[PDB]
Amino acid sequence: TLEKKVRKGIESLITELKLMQAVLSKVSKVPADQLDEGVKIWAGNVKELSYQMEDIVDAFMVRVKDLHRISAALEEVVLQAKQLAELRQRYEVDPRMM
Amino acid sequence: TLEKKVRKGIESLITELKLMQAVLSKVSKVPADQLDEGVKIWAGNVKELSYQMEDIVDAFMVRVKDLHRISAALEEVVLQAKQLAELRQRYEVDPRMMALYTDVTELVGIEETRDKLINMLTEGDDWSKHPLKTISIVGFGGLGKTTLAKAAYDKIKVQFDCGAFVSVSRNPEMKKVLKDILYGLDKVKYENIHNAARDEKYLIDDIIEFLNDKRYLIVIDDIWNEKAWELIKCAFSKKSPGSRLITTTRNVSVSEACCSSEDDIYRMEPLSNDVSRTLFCKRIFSQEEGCPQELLKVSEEILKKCGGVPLAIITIASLLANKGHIKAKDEWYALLSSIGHGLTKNRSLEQMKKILLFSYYDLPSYLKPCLLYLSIFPEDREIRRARLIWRWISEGFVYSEKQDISLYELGDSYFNELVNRSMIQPIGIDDEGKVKACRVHDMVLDLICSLSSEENFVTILDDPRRKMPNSESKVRRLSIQNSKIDVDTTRMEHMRSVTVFSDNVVGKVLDISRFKVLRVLDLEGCHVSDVGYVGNLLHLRYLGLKGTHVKDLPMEIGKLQFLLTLDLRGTKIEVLPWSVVQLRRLMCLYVDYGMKLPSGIGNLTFLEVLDDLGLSDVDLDFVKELGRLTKLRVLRLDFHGFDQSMGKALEESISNMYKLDSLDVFVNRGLINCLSEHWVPPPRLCRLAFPSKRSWFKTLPSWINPSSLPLLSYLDITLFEVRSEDIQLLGTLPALVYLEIWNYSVFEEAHEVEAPVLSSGAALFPCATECRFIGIGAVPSMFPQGAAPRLKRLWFTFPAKWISSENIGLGMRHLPSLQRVVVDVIS
Amino acid sequence: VNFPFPKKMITESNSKDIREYLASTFPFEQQSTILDQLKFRQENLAELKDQIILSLGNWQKLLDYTNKLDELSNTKISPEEFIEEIQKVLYKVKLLYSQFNLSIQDFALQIIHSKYKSNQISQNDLLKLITEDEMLKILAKTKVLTYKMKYFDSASKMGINKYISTEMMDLDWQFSHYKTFNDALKKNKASDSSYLGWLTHGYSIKYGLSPNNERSMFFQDGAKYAELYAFSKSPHRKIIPGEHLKDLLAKINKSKGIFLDQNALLDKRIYAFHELNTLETHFPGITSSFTDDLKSNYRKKMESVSLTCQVLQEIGNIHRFIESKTEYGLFSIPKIFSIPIDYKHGEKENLVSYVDFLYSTAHERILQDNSINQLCLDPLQESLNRIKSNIPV
Ligand SMILES: Nc1ncnc2c1ncn2[C@@H]1O[C@H](COP(=O)(O)OP(=O)(O)OP(=O)(O)O)[C@@H](O)[C@H]1O
């Protein structure tokens, strides 16, 4: 009953974690000179969000009362995810050659 | 009321299905090398939603209580698709070029094959006045096609004036190819030719005007998609004797588009066993082979796997010995176990996997799943192609909108398209006149299994593998194999298909009724007869029970309103239940002659192929009843107890059928009082077999005439007497690729082998590869070699009293490969 | 008993010592041995009507055609009408009732033999009537049914029912009528004899004579016979097999390999041997594996096992003879011509010595091998042990 919604939201968490590490790896290739600072700020924020999501999924997996705690936490972290979403859309030689 | 909203949402689901399939086809074109991981993850999730909504819509179609369930599932999957939508917005050289530069003294067995390629083109260079010809080389994946062309090329260049290699990729740019041809002809005048940007046409005109009064030998390789080569051929359209061309390709449907002659097509075969062994020992082993004497069997078994492909063996040998045989007899076996399921997940081997995936990527859509389906079947075994065709049709992989196609010929065309792309070896000829079974190369089969397992296309339980996925719920295709241990089947509720390979664990551990939705059920070779639950399965399409010890089947088969296959060979059942007319859709019914069919067969209007219909104790209405349903293409009939005017009734009722392609009638030691001499045969017919030998006709059937049934390619006829005009009449027929006649009275009465003659005409046999005459003397001094241009084997009888005669004029080499024959002689 | 091998010697001036007794005694009158009268069946042709009247009350047509059979047996009819009259019942009957049904047919067919052996039937008439396809399957079912009716009961308790061979059946003194039907037909039409043997063996399998859990992949199907006839009329079809023929070769070599083993189960090996041996006997050169036979001694193993079956059959016949002095079978020997219980003086001088040489004959040219020992040596030893503990009693 109650555990069902939590269980079916967890896989959404894993999926979007995979997408977030995809983005983070993509941005991490370019050196910190050709990267515009808006992307830097957004990337840092999504990194923190990813840590939060990983902690939540880990707590669920180690545990199974607390079901309601993690349910609130999950909906809460998804809420920061939604808020961080539209902020991004709201605003947009070789040295050893010598 | 409630039905209207769901009935309205279904086609919205269908529109979304079309859009998703379009984007999935677009994203699967790129190799999984330029595609970013985010798009790929999103694509996988989209694919999962695609399966779920197909299942929902199919459940609606088969079912129409349940409406509530359908509506709830539909709203849920809509919410899932919505939620997946915003995640994506929220978070957002040629490998074979090096081979071309390889040391010449590193190729083993090349010179003899090179000589065969040279003297099939330069034999006319002697008197280099012949019109120019092209020699096409075909093959599969990589087996010496480009190298062989270069060895020949580098050999014969002093005796020409021009020449160049040009390569054409998967998706050529015609101007680039033409500039490459121009550059290689002369590098001085055309030194900066790749900078000139005229068009596709002025530089064709320039290349034509350059090659006037010269013999060159231009060679073009790797030509795919024949429409590309129709441009180059216009560059080569002026008369130029003594000039020649070479073409290499993996498509055998483009080679006949070249050279217009089958003798110029060069099929090339893998290396022999000993040559492959010498190559294998040249790379790993330094100079001797007598040291190990303990891994020799391992090397044998490894070389058997690669077969003959110079590429596979070159790659494996490079992997096996980095520095002085760094591995011995333990990880050799580990490698051997790894191949088949997981070898490619390694290093320095991924080089060749791109060369093999080239062909897989070049496949159009609607054929990627058909090729991926082959991963179901085990490592080394022949796969009957009819099984694949029916499984494909039942799966939903075959579909169209033309209504001029019976949806079976379409599957056959797909199979032939797989064959001509040089990806599956066809072997043997079936009883219907086409390819019997197919076999796939071991390296390619293991490579595609991995590709299929990257998604949830199939799931295989194997003892060497002994591996399971993390999500038991998202399983659609299962292939139980030699494994009989971990047979958990709890959390696979939406299972699309299941098949079991030669296992006695089935049934006692398996529980199939628990699969509420199921599309095909395949049970070749099992020893289980407890089928009493198929009434609960209502989505079923394919039901194979060949050799299953099935003694009886449930009475409620009629409920399976959707059904396309029943294979019941080798079963213990001897009577079909009456509830089979209730079936409305069917295309095949594989039954044995022992079983008795209930009355009412005429209602199975959609039936497409019927096999081994037993006619024993049959009444007139039943015989007439088959004629109303006219969609058959293959029909097999045998009987023991109705040989009366009912025979003529059936013989006339068959002519109602207008779509036959094959026929065969079996009868024991009797005159054929079935076929009447005043009767039109079906317009289309190819096989028309008669496998009985104790039976006979009194005379040659009158309806057999070059005018009607012009597409015959098979007879298997037998007659009591024989005439010298019957053979001539048979010679009037257009195709008749296969020939066989039996003289019944010769083998049954005291009759002398006479010598019939073709008096009229000149050849009467333009194309008959096989000709067989039993009890009939077919003397090969019947006409000069310019009569039957293609005839690989010929059989006849030669009486011994004709040794002294003068009518035995053999000894000359006829046009076809007719130097192998052992004629049955009688004293 | 652990009776040792019966070591003897059969030479000249010893052959006729026992064969002369065998030349005139009740048994061996219509048989043969490896080392190499109208009243008797008239009385049964009269007694065919013993118990029929008892259970007439359904059963009336049995008595009615029993009377007709007895009438035709003694009456003389010209051959062109006798055959039609006797086929009136052969081509009408379909099926405690069935035991009496076959006895009508079994005695009916012996009339043709009785008149043919009396030169009343022309050979040409018999040749013209044997081409009928119906009678081939008819006689095929009658032979096996009659055999399993009577000799199966005695063989089952004897322990030799496991070694009953289909082709090796004409040797029975009661079934002395099939020599003509075999020889005349085979020297007049070789194909038809093979056909009828194939049908007979298929009926034997379907009727439990050699039962199995697996379907017959060589018998009970017209495809098979068509292909075998085509092979028999083409000596170069094994070289280039066609469709429906690769599988036959695969199955035959699986059968041969399964027979060649030693530790797998015995019943399936005997069954496979039965079918395969019938296959060569009726179709020569079907399994000419000239490479494997040389390394396996398979060809000689065929004679070894066939002679084992032969000697075991003769041992069973001797057992059924000695215990009689009704195990001879129903409608085999009438009450008056029966053999009483008292012992006869000629048996002590022609039975123990005869079985002594019989075993020695088979144990003089049989190869010994682990595979053959469980197929030939062990049955021979058990038969010897059982046959040397029952003669004095
Ligand atoms: N006879 C041979 N001896 C040794 N190596 C060979 C031999 N033939 C081919 N190879 C090597 O095997 C590899 C096969 O490449 P190949 O030139 O056959 O490609 P190909 O036939 O054109 O196939 P594709 O159509 O995939 O390009 C090359 O490295 C080639 O040098």
Mutate to test the interface with B, among A14, A23, A42 (most CBs of B within 10 A): A23
* Determination technique used: cryo-EM
Asked if B88 lies within 8 A of A19 by C-beta distance, the reply is: yes
Residue C7 CA, distance from chain mean position: 29
Strand ranges for B211-363 from DSSP E = 218-221, 244-249, 265-267
What distance in Å separates the CA atoms of residue B428 and residue B432, rounded to the nearest whole number? 12
From the list C215, C223, C229, the residue facing B694 with the nearest CB is C229
Query: Do A and C touch (≥3 CB pairs < 8 Å)?
Result: no
Kindly identify which residue of chain B lies nearest to residue C131, measuring between CA atoms.
B669
Residue in chain C lying closest to B547 (CA) = C215
Bridging pattern class, strands B459-461 and B477-480 = parallel
Q: Which residues pair with B165 in a beta bridge?
A: B219
Can you tell me which residue has the tokens 């004679």?
C303
Strands B425-429 and B497-500: unpaired
**Pair of tokens at residue A64:** 């199974």
Residue entry with tokens 């219509």: C30
Angle among Cα B437, B223, B94 to the nearest 5 degrees reads 100
Mutate which of B692, B696, B792 to test chain C, going by most C C-beta atoms within 10 A?
A: B692
Q: Which amino acid is at A51?
A: Y
DSSP letter string, B1-24: -HHHHHHHHHHHHHHHHHHHHHHH
CA-based radius of gyration for chain B: 31
Q: N- to C-terminal Cα distance for chain B?
A: 90
- Per the CB < 8 Å rule, is B83 touching A26? no
What is B640-685 written as a DSSP string? Answer: SS--SHHHHHHHHHHTT-----EEEEE-SSSB--S--SS-PPPS--
Question: Two tokens at B605?
Answer: 């209007």
Provide the token pair at C238: 């094994």
Yes or no, beta carbons of B668 and C222 under 8 Å apart:
yes
DSSP label of B132: P
Atom 24 of ligand 1, residue of closest alpha carbon: B142
DSSP string, C180-236: HHHHHHHTT-HHHHHHHHHHHHHHHHHTTSS--SS--SSSS-HHHHHHHHHHHT-TT
Query: Which residue in B has a C-alpha nearest to residue A14's C-alpha?
Result: B41
Q: Count Cβ atoms below 10 Å from residue C220 Cβ, excluding itself.
A: 16
Query: How many angstroms separate the alpha carbon of residue B142 from the centre of ligand 1?
Result: 6
How far apart CA C159 and CA B562 sit, in angstroms, is: 55
Q: Do B513 and B536 form a contact (C-beta atoms < 8 A)? A: yes
Mutate to test the interface with A, among B91, B92, B474 (most CBs of A within 10 A): B91
B466 is in an annotated binding site: no
The response to whether residue B114 sits with its C-beta less than 6 Å from ligand 1 reads: no
| Rounded distance from Cα B311 to ligand 1 centre (Å) | 6
Alpha-carbon distance B39 to nearest alpha carbon in chain A (angstroms): 9
B141 Cα to the center of ligand 1, angstroms: 9
Note whether C110 and C177 are within 8 A (CB). yes
How far, in Å, CA of B730 to CA of B764, rounded? 8
Most informative mutation of B248, B311, B351, B360 for ligand 1 (most atoms within 8 A of CB): B311
Query: Which CA distances in Å does B356 have to A42, B142, B353, B447, C268?
Result: 42, 8, 5, 9, 48
- Whether A19 and B83 lie within 8 Å, measured CB to CB: no
Q: Is B459 annotated as a binding residue?
A: no
Question: What counts of helices (H) and strands (E) characterise chain B?
Answer: 22, 24
Whole-angstrom distance, CA of residue C190 vs CA of residue B199: 81
Phi, psi for residue B318 in degrees, rounded to 5: -65, -40
- B326 within 8 A of B293, measured Cβ to Cβ: no
Q: Determine the residue among B551, B669, B714 to mutate to test chain C binding: the one whose Cβ has the most chain C Cβ atoms within 10 Å.
A: B669
Q: Is B145 annotated to bind ligand?
A: yes
Torsion-angle region of C357 (φ positive above 0: left; ψ -120 to 50: alpha; else: beta): alpha
Report CA(B96)–ligand 1 centroid distance (Å): 9
CA of A55 to nearest chain B CA: how many angstroms apart?
Answer: 20
Rounded Cα distance, B560 and B580, in Å: 10
Residue B732 to residues A59, B13, B359, B770, B773, Cα–Cα distance (Å): 85, 58, 43, 16, 17
**For a pocket test of ligand 1, which of B108, B146, B313, B318 has the largest count of ligand atoms closer than 8 A to its C-beta?**
B146
Please state whether beta strands B770-774 and B717-719 pair in parallel, antiparallel, or not at all (unpaired): unpaired
B617 touches chain C (CB under 8 A): no
What angle in degrees, to the nearest 10, is found between the helix axes of C178-186 and C97-117?
60
- Any chains having at least 3 CB pairs less than 8 A from chain B are A, C
B109 lines ligand 1 (CB under 6 A): yes
CA–CA gap between residue C219 and residue C251 (Å, rounded): 13
In angstroms, the CA C103 to CA C108 distance is 8
Kindly state the helix (H) or strand (E) to which residue C285 belongs, with its residue range. none
What residues have CB less than 8 Å from B597, skipping those under 6 apart? Answer: B576, B580, B591, B613, B614
Which residues are registered as beta bridge partners of B773?
B741
User: Whose CA is closest to B335, among B315, B355, B307?
Assistant: B315
Residue B484 identity = K
Q: Are strands B824-826 and B588-590 parallel, antiparallel or unpaired?
A: unpaired
DSSP letter at B271 equals: P
Q: Which residues of C touch B774 (CB under 8 A)?
A: 233-234
Would the CB of B272 count as within 6 Å of ligand 1? no
- Number of separate helices (H) and strands (E) present in chain C: 17, 0
> What is residue B698's DSSP assignment?
S
Tokens representing C125 are 């008439």
* A22 has a chain B CB within 8 A of its CB: yes
CA dihedral for B680, B682, B686, B688, sign (positive or negative): negative
Taking the C-alpha atoms of B780, B783, B787 and B793 in order, what is their torsion angle to the nearest 10 degrees? 0
Test B691 with C226 for CB contact under 8 angstroms.
yes
Rounded to whole angstroms, the Cα distance separating A64 from A71 reads 13
- Nearest ligand 1 atom, CA B221: 22
**Distances B520 to A65, B478, B542, C183 between C-alpha atoms, Å:** 45, 11, 4, 56
Distance from C-alpha of B608 to C-alpha of B588, rounded to nearest angstrom? 6
Integer Cα distance of C287 and C253 in angstroms: 8
> Rounded CA gap, B489 and C44, in Å?
68
Q: Sort out which chain C residues have CB atoms less than 8 A from B694's CB and list them.
A: 226, 229
Query: How is residue C218 written in tokens?
Result: 């060589």
Q: How far is C372 from B808, CA to CA, in rounded Å?
A: 52
**Nearest CA owner, ligand 1 atom 13:** B311
B138 phi and psi, to 5 degrees? -120, 165
Alpha carbon distances (Å) from B699 to B581, B673, B717, B722, C103: 40, 12, 11, 8, 45
B210 vs B214: CA distance, rounded Å: 9
Q: Among all residues of chain C, which has the CA nearest to that of B570?
A: C215
Of B691, B692, B747, the CB nearest to C233: B747
CA of C356 to the centre of ligand 1 (A): 76
| Alpha-carbon span B353 to B447, nearest angstrom | 8
Whether B575 and chain C come into contact, CB under 8 Å, resolves to no
Hey, which residues does A76 pair with through a beta bridge?
none
In angstroms, rounded to a whole number, what is the distance separating the alpha carbons of residues B134 and B588?
Answer: 45
Rounded-to-integer distance, Cα B821 and Cα B267, Å: 25
The answer to whether B356 touches B445, Cβ cutoff 8 Å, is no
Contact B693 C244 (CB under 8 A): no
How is residue B770 annotated by DSSP?
E
DSSP secondary structure string for all residues of A26-91: HHHHS-TTSS-HHHHHHHHHHHHHHHHHHHHHHHHHHH--HHHHHHHHHHHHHHHHHHHHHHHHH-
φ and ψ at B567, to 5 degrees? Answer: -105, 120
Residue whose pair of structure tokens reads 């949402």 in the numeric block = B9
Cβ pair B544, B525 in contact under 8 A? no
Cross-chain Cβ contact A19/B38 below 8 Å? yes
Cβ separation A12–B37 shorter than 8 A? no
* Residue corresponding to tokens 């595979």: C371
Phi–psi pair at B198, nearest 5 degrees: -90, -70
CA B696 to chain CA mean position, Å: 36
* Resolution number, Å: 3.6
CB B663 within 8 A of CB B687: yes
B602 is known to lie in a ligand binding site? no
Q: Is the CB of B311 under 6 A from ligand 1?
A: yes
Separation between Cα atoms, residue C278 and residue C165, nearest integer Å? 9
B580 lines ligand 1 (CB under 6 A): no
Three-state SS for B739? strand
Instruction: Write the CB contacts of B329 (distance below 8 Å, at least 6 apart in sequence).
Output: B294, B295, B298
User: In chain B, whose CA is at the least distance from the CA of A21?
Assistant: B38
B549 contacts on C by Cβ (under 8 Å): 213
Write out B544-601 in H/E/C secondary structure: ECCCCCCCCCCHHHHHCCCCCEEECCCCCCCECCCCCCCCCCCCEEECCCCCECCCCH
Residue B702 CB neighbour total at 10 angstroms: 11
Token digits of residue B73: 């599932």
CB B355 within 8 A of CB B429: no
Of ligand 1's atoms, which has the minimum distance to the CA of residue B99?
Answer: 29
Distance CA B269, CA C343 (A): 82
Q: Is B648 in the pocket of ligand 1 (CB under 6 A)?
A: no
Which of B41, B83, B90 minimises the CB distance to A18? Answer: B41
Residues followed by a gap in chain B, C→N > 2.5 Å = 64, 92
Nearest CA of chain C to the CA of B428: how many Å?
A: 8
Cβ–Cβ contact B38 with A under 8 A: yes
User: Residue C360 phi/psi, 5° resolution?
Assistant: -60, -40
B823 interfaces chain C, CB cutoff of 8 Å: no
